[PDB]
């Protein structure tokens, strides 16, 4: 995908499988004030092998991993079970908030990283350790043409490799970081007609193009090429154009400035559920009941402007939706947020069937298991479930 | 120096 | 066929019915639900044999179905639906290679490819009571199929009539227990356990001794058919596949080559879970196995198929996928034609209800509006007609004419007509129907020459679908009107469409009373039969043949018929219910074709309608409705020979035994029409019989027979095969100078009467042969329609671009064709533009224009029933027109009347250039 | 008529000389006006698009694409030879001087052509071509010509004329990275010209 690293630079490496985003000590130098992190990235494909988007974000910081799947919550638990948008693991004031549009978490080092449910990830660092940088966002120093070296520390004179050199320890089956066979490039003819108004329309440079004044905050040149590369290899379906423009408009909104009004003219206009209060400009950190409802408020909610559909007009912003003011609005067990009763699982076990009263501030649980030949353990970015313990296969030959 | 605190963005596509 | 059970156990069978392989013997108690898969069987090929037709699944309230007849797509409840059927926390079906995978939350998983295998993968918790052929979850292969006995054909759901018997012969050809196979060898069938070869690695991980013993009886089935060969070795190699394994390449083009859908490859690893139009990988576990198959490249499986182009995927509407410019009809009862809207909105347009006596139900995989009615025309004698209903009014006519004919154009119909054009003197009758602005030969004189456009139609498909069932020919379009041809003047033409009303003419549709009230197009007053027959009249006729015996001495010899019986007093012995040579009289009233047995001719003298002329009409097309013909030929009074190697049956279903892989066979009525059926390892194609050595060819919609050079539309090469190896469509433009025309009934291109050439090195001919080149800049008129004269022609005033671009020496730069409705416009450099808009370059418009690239890169244009012009990928250009166009055209290119002398190519003045020229396209030519 | 067009506009409570709001003139002394404040010679002969409905745009304004040839026709002038108006059906191309080709036939000047299309040749010598909620064309004797659109669309059509939003630089060359080809040069027509 499009990349924007610690340091000050940005690139277009394309990828098949985990490769290393961020983190600090890779050889484990710096034995001083010692508080290693790292986070990785990976990279799935929708039927065109010409680029690749974010799929599964990974991190690992002080023996807790964290995940996200492209989804609307979760995957980032150690036990393997999703947690909310509100979430406390109480242990080192660990906690994961989600904007309305957005996906951030802090810890007692207040460390951040914002991915959203469809292919927008970013990274923010605690001011914890910021002396040197391990992974793709490169050494981070104020130089940006030495960040690319291998984790070996030598000398990278190959970027294309330089993802599978960062890469997640192991054997990739079919990982390629470039097309290996004939790569369905794009035809020039069409980006000429595709690039005009009503497709990457606005994201063009333009006074009386809309956000003209979030263009002098965030430049926009690197989001240019990116929507007429990634629309012309694309079938050139509507959507691609608003997920494109959208990355920009938060991008520039969030360095401060306001925004006005442009999903209107241009056609793509979200159909939010509920309240579904579309604003220019609004609040972030919607408001939701902590779990704790106790616990210090996050120092990123004091922040700029996100454009999303804000639903706390009216009803609260709890469990991804819109709930009423008297809606469940969590569970709030030990620091942990269990929504609208989704019938979870607490732990690896399989026994606790744990559905929750979010009204009540409490759960009602059940202690059975799957058993029946299907055991346990933790499913693909899912719940603690129910997985076959064999399946055999019948062979119905024909001649 | 505690003026450098900094962000990596990864954008979708 | 042979299959293994989970148990272990391995055993055979051959049927033909439709059977279950797996199904849960009660209703699981509780987390999961009833699963059962139904199994069809066919005879293919030969007898005693069987290849697996379709595998029916139905769990959670929902029947999904999946055929061979119809490769990779599913069947929902009835009707045709897109594969990527994600519904929720269950039924995730999604195409996997060349198998489909039914992907459940519950443990069951199926797995299926059609041709000949299928994998049905059982939860453990399955166990208890599983009653499906597949045996128990036991996995002991000994009590494996012990409740329901031995027989390994005792489960069967449904099924045709006829599955139970192969033939009234005991299923011909059992094969041989010993297996006398001289193909053991390691030339053919010998490539799954011989060692050090390209499937080594299985040969270890997979014991082949279970699976070598079903590839010796596809040779004594059939000796080495590469259709025999094909799909066990890579049933074997899916089943190896399953456990890992880094097979070499098993498929070779001399042993087993493969063909697959438009911009689809084979590959022996690739992935198992292609993207498809909801852009989601199936959640399921995948890259487990790096299935062999086709995968389309720069393109996705859109509804399971047709590897679309990029970003077209349709509309999501309701959760079923549904395709780009689908009528979905998705509400009940037609209530809405919606459109798929371009941008995945469910564009939604309140329909009309259409015609009262229309319904509106789910048939043939579509829901819309049906005909409900049904009709029946005869037409058994010579002369002998028979009107739309009631009495019969025998016209003894002795011309062209035309049975029912359109009166009244309407949107939802069709071009629909039939007309009989009695040969001469009485004789029998030769049928030809035209349906879609198309014209169809059904039959002729001898058994089969079914004329078309192509007069070799053996077993052909398109818009219309004919089926050479036996003894008769049936015909069927896309809308099911059924037309019939005995070969001698017997007809049967079952017309259901409801056109009612709307159809006029010796078959009229007056509905009403027996008279039926015929009307003509200006009044009708019955002034005498002949009066019928002079009012209709149809075209092409030679010399306008006259009606009517000198004398009318032809029906006095009946009087003789009184005197003395001399007429059929066996036809009267065999049409009475005592005569057992027709049991349908209670399908069809026998009183029609009696009076026609005994007044066809002078039944024992004079003018020669025979017993064996008129006999066998009635009971041989007495098999159009279902019916059991007991053999009339008893004693074979008249004998019905065999061309070689064949033995004569009253029920011969050669629908079955085709020797295309391709079977258009309508159905066959669900019945066997009458003939004479080859044996021993028989294949029958258009009468000769060869035994099983040279029928391995197949093709889309035309069987092509061995060593054939079928060539289909558009002159791009030719599909020749060989029976070793071939069956490779070779593609190649048709040269310059000949065209695609039907030359005495073949496709194969040949120089059309009209060659106005252009730029066949800068060569300008006359359609007429003066030759005089363009030799100046611009947009030229050549073939234009000369005005006010009312003919076919449009005002198709073709401006050749002959600019200097390439090389500055005035090849072909563009082209520029109005059309009378566009200024189309394509150019070999870059790009066709229509209406100045650019388009892809492989798109053609039947009513408008041929555009398509040569594998060289040349582009063609050519209107139906219109004009045509080359253009090579360097400038080149012949014109080409049929001589149907008689002058009748005044353009650069001359009349050709088929006179040189005639349009004298503007002899007083330049046609060329002096006159037609354009100049709308011209500069302002003033400074 | 008047020199700049302005026809069936009803204004003050009647149909007058009034102008629209929709208007580009079109090499009027040489000198293109787009929608908005710019001015400029083509300086290239062809056939160079002016105005279209953009591609994909929602309105349901019909396709009424244009290519006025470059040709110098009466002496130099570089004045639109021919108004190939490309409507949806087929071309409708008018000439002054000689009757209209309309789909390849020569036309009555006073009739209506096509469809929902008035075309008639001015009393003075020029030739008018309308279509209703849509594009006219006012093609004079000595080549003078204005496109002209009604003021019903703002920046919903990109052209050479580009947007109607009336922002003088934003539609010329766009602003920072873009490639607009405002001389178009539509190869359909346009001779291929390679060497
Ligand atoms: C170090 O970099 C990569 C990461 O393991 C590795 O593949 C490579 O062989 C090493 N190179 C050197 C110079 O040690
Ligand atoms: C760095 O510190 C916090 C941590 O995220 C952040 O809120 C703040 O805005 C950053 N500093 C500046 C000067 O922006
Ligand atoms: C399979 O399930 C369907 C679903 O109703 C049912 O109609 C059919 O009879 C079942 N087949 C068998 C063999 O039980
Ligand atoms: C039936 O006979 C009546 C009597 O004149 C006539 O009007 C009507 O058209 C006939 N209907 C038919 C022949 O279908
Ligand atoms: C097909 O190939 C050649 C063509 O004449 C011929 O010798 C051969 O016998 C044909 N095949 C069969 C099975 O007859
Ligand atoms: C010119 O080429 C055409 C192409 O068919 C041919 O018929 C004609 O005989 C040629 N004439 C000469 C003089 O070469
Ligand atoms: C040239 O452009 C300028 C700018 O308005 C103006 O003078 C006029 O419109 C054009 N023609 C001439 C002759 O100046
Ligand atoms: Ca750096
Ligand atoms: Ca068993
Ligand atoms: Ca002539
Ligand atoms: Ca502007």
């Known amino acids: ?399 | 120096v505690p003026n450098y605190n900094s962000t990596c963005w990864l954008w979708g596509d | 066929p042979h299959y293994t059970t989970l148990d272990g156990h391995r055993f055979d069978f051959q049927g033909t019915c439709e059977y279950l392989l797996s199904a849960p013997c009660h209703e699981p108690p509780t987390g999961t639900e009833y699963f059962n898969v139904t199994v069809a069987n066919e005879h293919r090929g030969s007898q005693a044999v069987s290849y697996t037709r379709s595998v029916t699944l139905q769990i959670y309230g929902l029947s999904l179905t999946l055929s061979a007849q119809w490769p990779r797509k599913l069947q929902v409840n009835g009707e045709f639906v897109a594969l990527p059927f994600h519904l929720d926390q269950k039924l995730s079906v999604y195409i996997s290679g060349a198998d489909v995978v039914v992907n459940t939350a519950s443990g069951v998983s199926l797995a299926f490819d059609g041709d000949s295998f299928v994998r049905l993968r059982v939860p453990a918790a399955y166990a208890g009571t599983l009653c499906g052929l597949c045996g128990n979850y036991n996995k002991n292969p000994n009590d494996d199929l012990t409740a329901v006995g031995g027989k390994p054909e005792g489960w069967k759901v449904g099924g045709a009539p006829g599955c139970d018997q192969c033939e009234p012969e005991p299923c011909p050809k059992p094969c041989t227990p010993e297996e006398q196979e001289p193909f053991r060898g390691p030339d053919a069938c010998g490539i799954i356990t011989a060692p050090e070869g390209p499937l080594a690695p299985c040969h270890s991980l997979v014991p082949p001794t279970q699976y070598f013993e079903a590839c010796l009886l596809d040779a004594c089935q059939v000796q080495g058919h590469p259709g025999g060969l094909c799909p066990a070795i890579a049933t074997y190699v899916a089943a190896c596949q399953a456990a890992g394994a880094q097979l070499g390449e098993w498929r070779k083009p001399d042993f087993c080559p493969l063909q697959c859908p438009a911009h689809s490859h084979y590959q022996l690893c690739g992935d198992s879970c292609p993207v498809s139009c909801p852009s989601l990988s199936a959640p399921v576990g995948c890259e487990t196995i790096c299935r062999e198959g086709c995968v389309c490249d720069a393109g996705f499986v859109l509804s399971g198929d047709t590897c679309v182009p990029v970003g077209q995927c349709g509309c999501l509407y309701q959760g079923r996928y549904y395709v780009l410019g689908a009528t979905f009809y998705p509400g009940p009862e037609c209530e809405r034609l919606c459109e798929c809207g371009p941008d995945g909105q469910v564009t939604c347009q309140e329909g009309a209800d259409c015609e009262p006596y229309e319904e509106c139900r789910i048939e043939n995989g579509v829901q819309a509006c049906h005909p409900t009615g049904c009709g029946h025309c005869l037409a058994n004698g010579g002369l002998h007609y028979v009107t739309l209903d009631g009495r019969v009014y025998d016209l003894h006519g002795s011309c062209s004419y035309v049975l029912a004919s359109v009166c009244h154009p309407k949107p939802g119909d069709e071009e629909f007509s039939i007309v009989l054009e009695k040969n001469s003197a009485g004789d029998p009758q030769r049928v030809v129907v035209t349906v879609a602005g198309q014209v169809v030969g059904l039959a002729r004189g001898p058994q089969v020459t079914v004329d078309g456009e192509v007069v070799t139609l053996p077993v052909a498909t398109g818009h219309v679908s004919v089926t050479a069932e036996g003894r008769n020919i049936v015909l069927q379009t896309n809308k099911g009107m059924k037309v019939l041809f005995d070969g001698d003047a017997h007809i049967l033409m079952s017309i259901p469409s409801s056109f009612r009303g709307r159809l006029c003419g010796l078959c009229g549709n007056f509905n009403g009373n027996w008279s039926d009230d015929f009307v003509l197009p200006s009044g009708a007053v019955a002034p005498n039969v002949e009066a019928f027959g002079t009012a209709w009249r149809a075209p092409g006729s030679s010399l306008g043949c006259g009606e009517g015996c000198g004398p009318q001495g032809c029906p006095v010899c009946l009087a003789e018929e009184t005197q003395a019986y001399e007429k059929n007093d066996a036809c009267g012995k065999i049409r009475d219910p005592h005569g057992p040579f027709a049991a349908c009289h209670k399908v069809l009233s026998p009183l029609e074709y009696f009076r026609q047995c005994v007044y066809d001719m002078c039944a024992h003298k004079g003018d020669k309608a025979y017993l064996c002329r008129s006999l066998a009409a009635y009971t041989a097309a007495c098999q159009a409705a279902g019916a059991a013909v007991k053999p009339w030929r008893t004693d074979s009074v008249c004998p019905l020979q065999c061309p070689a190697h064949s033995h004569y049956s009253i029920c011969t279903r050669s629908c079955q035994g085709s020797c295309a892989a391709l079977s258009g066979l309508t159905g066959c009525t669900t019945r066997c029409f009458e003939g004479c059926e080859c044996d021993d390892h028989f294949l029958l194609s258009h009468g000769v019989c060869i035994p099983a050595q040279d029928c391995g060819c197949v093709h889309n919609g035309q069987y092509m027979p061995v060593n054939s050079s079928l060539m289909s539309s558009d002159c791009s090469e030719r599909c020749f095969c060989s029976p070793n190896n071939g069956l490779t469509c070779h593609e190649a433009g048709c040269p310059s100078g000949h065209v695609c025309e039907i030359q005495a009934g073949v496709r194969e291109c040949q120089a059309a009467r009209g060659l106005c050439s252009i730029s066949v090195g800068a060569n300008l001919t006359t359609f007429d042969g003066a030759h005089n080149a363009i030799s100046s800049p611009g947009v030229y008129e050549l073939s234009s329609r000369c005005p006010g004269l009312q003919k076919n022609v449009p005002w198709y005033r073709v401006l050749a671009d002959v600019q200097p671009c390439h090389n500055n020496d005035k090849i072909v730069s563009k082209v520029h064709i109005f059309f009378q409705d566009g200024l189309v416009t394509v150019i070999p450099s870059k790009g066709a533009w229509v209406n100045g808009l650019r388009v892809d370059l492989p798109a053609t418009v039947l009513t408008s224009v041929s555009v398509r690239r040569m594998p060289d890169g040349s582009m063609l244009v050519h209107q139906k029933a219109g004009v045509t012009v080359w253009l090579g990928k360097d400038g080149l250009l012949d014109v080409m027109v049929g001589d149907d166009l008689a002058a009748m055209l005044c353009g650069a290119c001359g009349n050709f009347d088929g006179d040189q002398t005639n349009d004298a190519y503007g002899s007083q003045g330049k046609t060329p250039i002096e006159k037609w020229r354009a100049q709308d396209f011209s500069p302002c030519s003033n400074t």
């Open chain 1, 1 to 399: 995908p499009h990349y924007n690293s610690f340091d000050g630079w940005s690139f277009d490496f394309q990828g098949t499988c985990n490769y290393l985003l961020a983190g600090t000590l890779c050889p484990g130098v710096n034995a001083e004030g010692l508080t290693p992190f790292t986070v990785t990235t990976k990279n799935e494909n929708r039927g065109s092998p010409a680029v690749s988007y974010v799929r599964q974000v990974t991190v690992t910081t002080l023996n807790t991993n964290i995940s996200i799947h492209k989804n609307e919550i979760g995957k980032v638990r150690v036990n393997g079970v999703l947690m909310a948008l509100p979430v406390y693991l109480a242990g080192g004031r660990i906690s994961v908030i989600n904007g309305g549009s957005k996906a951030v978490l802090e810890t007692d080092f207040g460390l951040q990283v914002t991915y959203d449910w469809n292919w927008r990830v970013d990274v923010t660092l605690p001011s914890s350790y910021h002396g040197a940088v391990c992974g793709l966002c490169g050494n981070m120093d104020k130089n940006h043409q030495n960040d690319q070296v291998f984790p070996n520390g030598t000398m990278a004179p190959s970027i294309p490799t330089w993802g599978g050199s960062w890469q997640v320890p192991g054997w990739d089956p079919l990982c390629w970081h470039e097309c290996q066979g004939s790569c369905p490039t794009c035809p020039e003819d069409r980006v000429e007609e595709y690039e005009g108004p009503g497709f990457c329309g606005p994201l063009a440079p333009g006074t009386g193009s809309p956000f003209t004044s979030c263009h002098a905050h965030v430049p926009p040149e690197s989001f240019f090429k990116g929507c007429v590369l990634d629309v012309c290899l694309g079938g050139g379906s509507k959507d691609i154009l608003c997920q494109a423009l959208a990355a920009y408009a938060a991008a520039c909104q969030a360095a401060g400035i306001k925004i006005e009004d442009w999903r209107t003219q241009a056609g793509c206009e979200i159909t939010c559920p509920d309240n579904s209060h579309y604003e220019l400009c609004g609040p972030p950190c919607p408001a939701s009941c902590p779990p704790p409802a106790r616990h210090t408020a996050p120092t990123v909610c004091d922040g700029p402007c996100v454009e999303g559909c804000q639903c706390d007009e009216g009803f609260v912003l709890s469990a991804d939706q819109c709930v009423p003011l008297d809606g469940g609005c969590g569970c709030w067990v030990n620091g942990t947020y269990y929504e609208a009763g989704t019938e979870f699982w607490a732990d690896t076990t399989c026994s606790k069937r744990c559905h929750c009263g979010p009204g009540g501030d409490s759960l009602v649980c059940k202690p059975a298991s799957c058993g029946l030949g299907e055991e346990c353990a933790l499913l693909p970015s899912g719940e603690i479930g129910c997985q076959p313990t064999s399946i055999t296969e019948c062979q119905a030959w024909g001649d």
